[PDB]
């Protein structure tokens, strides 16, 4: 069992944690963008991850989510954890 969130899933969720739907375009291959560059707090990354934890069946330790600079890593946390141990 490993329902992997896709680009779109991460996108929608990550916009959702910004509060209002401003619309930081996170479509296509936005995985090379950076959270620091898009003004994201690591606290917010934890918040982002927290949502995905309960949704997909993963658990991301507090400090881990603060160590993700690019969206690819945050996505890879969920995807990877499910593939590793679900």
Ligand X SMILES: *P(=O)(O)OCC(C)(C)[C@H](O)C(=O)NCCC(=O)NCCS
Positions in the binding site for ligand X (CB under 6 A): 36, 41-43, 66
Burial of 63-81, coded b for 16+ CB within 10 Å and e otherwise, reads ebbeebebbbbbbebbbeb
The residue (of 8 and 41) whose beta carbon lies closer to ligand X is 41
CA distances from 7 to 28, 70, 76 (A): 8, 13, 11
Smallest separation (angstroms) from ligand X to the CB of 35? 6
The residue (of 61 and 66) whose beta carbon lies closer to ligand X is 66
Smallest separation (angstroms) from ligand X to the CB of 46? 9
The residue (of 2 and 50) whose beta carbon lies closer to ligand X is 50
Residue nearest to ligand X (CB): 42
Contact of 49 with 60, CB cutoff 8 Å: yes
């Amino acid at each position: 069992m490993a329902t992997l969130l896709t680009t779109d899933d991460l996108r929608r969720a990550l916009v959702e944690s910004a509060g209002e739907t401003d619309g930081t375009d996170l479509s296509g291959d936005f995985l090379d963008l950076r959270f620091e560059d898009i003004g994201y707090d690591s606290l917010a990354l934890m918040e982002t991850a927290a949502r995905l934890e309960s949704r997909y069946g993963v658990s991301i330790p507090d400090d881990v989510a603060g160590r993700v600079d690019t969206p690819r890593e945050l996505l890879d946390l969920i995807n990877g954890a499910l593939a590793e141990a679900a």
